[PDB]
Design an enzyme around this catalytic site. Sequence first.
Site, short mmCIF file in Angstrom:
data_model
loop_
_atom_site.label_atom_id
_atom_site.label_comp_id
_atom_site.label_asym_id
_atom_site.label_seq_id
_atom_site.Cartn_x
_atom_site.Cartn_y
_atom_site.Cartn_z
CG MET A 62 -0.18 -3.40 4.89
SD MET A 62 -1.14 -1.92 4.41
CE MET A 62 -2.35 -2.73 3.32
CD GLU A 63 -5.17 -2.08 5.47
OE1 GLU A 63 -4.20 -1.71 6.17
OE2 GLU A 63 -5.76 -1.32 4.66
CG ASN A 64 -0.37 -6.83 3.82
OD1 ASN A 64 -0.42 -5.97 2.95
ND2 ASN A 64 0.56 -6.85 4.77
CD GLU A 114 -2.97 1.25 2.21
OE1 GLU A 114 -2.76 0.56 3.22
OE2 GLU A 114 -3.90 2.07 2.12
CD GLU A 148 -3.24 -2.03 10.63
OE1 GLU A 148 -3.71 -2.17 9.49
OE2 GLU A 148 -2.80 -0.93 11.05
#
EC number: 3.4.11.2
Length: 866
Positions: free
Chosen positions: A259-261, A117, A294
């Site tokens: 980071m919300e992967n 992102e 997240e």
Amino acid sequence: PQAKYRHDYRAPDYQITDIDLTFDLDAQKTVVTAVSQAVRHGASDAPLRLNGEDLKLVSVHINDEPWTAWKEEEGALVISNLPERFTLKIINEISPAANTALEGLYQSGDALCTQCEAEGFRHITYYLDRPDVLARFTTKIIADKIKYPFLLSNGNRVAQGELENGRHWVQWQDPFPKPCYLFALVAGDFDVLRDTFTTRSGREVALELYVDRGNLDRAPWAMTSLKNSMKWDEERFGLEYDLDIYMIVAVDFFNMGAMENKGLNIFNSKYVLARTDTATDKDYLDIERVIGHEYFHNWTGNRVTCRDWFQLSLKEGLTVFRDQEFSSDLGSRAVNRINNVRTMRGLQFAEDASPMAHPIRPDMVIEMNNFYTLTVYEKGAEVIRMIHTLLGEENFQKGMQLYFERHDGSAATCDDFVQAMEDASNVDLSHFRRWYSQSGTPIVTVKDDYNPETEQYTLTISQRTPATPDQAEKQPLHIPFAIELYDNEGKVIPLQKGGHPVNSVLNVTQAEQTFVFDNVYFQPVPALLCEFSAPVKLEYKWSDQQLTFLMRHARNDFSRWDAAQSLLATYIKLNVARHQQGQPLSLPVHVADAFRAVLLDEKIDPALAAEILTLPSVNEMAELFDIIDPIAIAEVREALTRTLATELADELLAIYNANYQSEYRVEHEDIAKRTLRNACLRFLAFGETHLADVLVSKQFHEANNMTDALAALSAAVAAQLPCRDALMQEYDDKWHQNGLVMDKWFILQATSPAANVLETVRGLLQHRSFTMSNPNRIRSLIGAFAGSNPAAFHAEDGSGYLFLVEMLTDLNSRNPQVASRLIEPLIRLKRYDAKRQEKMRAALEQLKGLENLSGDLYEKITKALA
Ligand SMILES: N[C@@H](Cc1ccc(O)cc1)C(=O)O
Ligand code: NA
Ligand code: NA
Ligand SMILES: [Zn+2]
């Protein structure tokens, strides 16, 4: 660098439905094979334009045919003459070890990890690197087994194998279509904390937290917080996790927070690792917040994503709102609200008054990494909260339900979300939408009148948003303006008109309007903009006694703290003017008395007392002034602290001792008492020197937790106590091997009131625990100096600006994202006096002339110099 505009959005000429990735991993040279199934939606003569940055192209095939109809251009691979449906195969090389920017695939210590992102995936392969292209991913990873025994990507493991020459491979599949910004890959050797969560409906989820070898002792709180987040999203929002495994990887080298992967979150270790001797109460609560954040993105960001990056607030405003609600439900709602309001008034308002001002839905962006902002996040959340205020919880949840029903599995817009809320609730939000398009902070002016003949109270409320650098035109907003009226006994007066009750949330929708209330049987003391019901500056001519009355009587703890802030604002402004005239602090006796009463109140929640006894920061103070005098502000804050320390000495010591706790617990009642105790210690440190030195030294040495140790150390630095140098050396000697712990110490060094602070900071660039290669270290030393020591940063000799220029000259090349974070204090030049402006302008001009100036810095510098 070219600006991109929201109004230019157009659906893509091509979609990709499925992508199969293979990584032949190596730190020096990684080979990526990407097989994409594509469909043309545009004109038969439209080429496929793939984004790519710093890629070495090896081959291009279309349905296994080597393709001759392509060209590489700046940032792109343009492929012509394609069928309506086809298989695209790209092979390309990248170099993780060369990636100092930490975007795409890079090295974090011995690990390889990704950050995609906003537009990092194009640094990995040629792709449709835009969030309205959703595809089903499979990911095969091939690597040295000794170096990289764990090979992780999104979803579930579907295949694994061993190869010759000590290599092995794993393949992952994620069933949910996703934009590529949600792609993640991690390779390395880790300790793994494994646990389980069973969803309401009975789905068993494997939870896996990957940390560097030796760090398992610091993982349980993050795991606990993950489970807490999962449970809360079920209880509050009715949302369950949708996959079989939830992985989190803690990495030391990371530009943001986390980071919300999908199914494989990657976190800055600062927001994972905690033990009672290394982490403060604040760290524990921040880990809780960010783990929650997240996790909450799984629905608000992943299951429903963003059509384009101008819609960033669609996921960030809403997910910030969710993390605040999570923290508030689990902890003290009042303390959370207070802290979030401090951030809005002290940091976000500053941004909205700056050259970088933007609406929560931006209209123009040069570098999207510059728009992960206080505005998009925190003001974005205030906008969601206003919807919640207008709708109420039940209607708001109906809106959430309709939003997911309509948009699950797709990329949506801010407007889509507002429409879902409006449709589900039958509340008209057409005017409200202007909050998405208009930048700057509205100013709401209130005048009142009480008519004893008619027993009517009249509020005349006006609004205006001053022009901002980005927008010459401003219009009235739909401002939810919450009020309460108090009689002489401190009882709430029922709001009514013409024999009918009136909702306490007033709809302030015009430039000027009047509200009349009946049966107001006594002249009221009003509480205005209750719980900070809209993100606005309030102008009301308070008396001191109205404010102290509210501190005593207001129903909501937030209103009591907010009244104290209004009371302090008056005297902060007074004393800054006095400082400029060379005069000492002046404070009415009745003002000190109000704070004494807070200390001695046996009924007040210690959590509230602690916040009332925490003075506004130098950043909050700055936003009381058109032209900021950072030296006057710093010295007034100190003088106010010293004055209260002297006037309240006995009371402060009593409350300090009364709130002693032998057991350390990360539990909200305990945290509240400790926050109060340490608030008292802060004042005591600025009292009589010998007592101060004894108290602070004793707490540092006797502390059984980092909260109390750091509170003492910070006080020793702030008050320049005799014990300071000894305590600082002791901490260094104990903790130098631990970067996260040393960050706290770099912050204290950077924010020191000492005359020689810049000399010390420069010297610390050579410290054993510091490195320019690590964003956390950079932010804790250099960032804290520039952003959190404005008195020193704005030294009259211009030395602060010159230092920042030197640091940014390095970082512009090394890590533009961190550089752009760090340049922020310099772009605020128009808030400062003429002499300072000229030096800051010179500094910006020097940076503008850098060879290979990053787009990140270019965008901010050009706006600042305009
Ligand atoms: N998507 C992350 C933020 C983020 C953005 C960009 C990054 O490079 C890293 C992190 C969040 O807000 O949850
Ligand atoms: Na802004
Ligand atoms: Na009045
Ligand atoms: Zn987020």
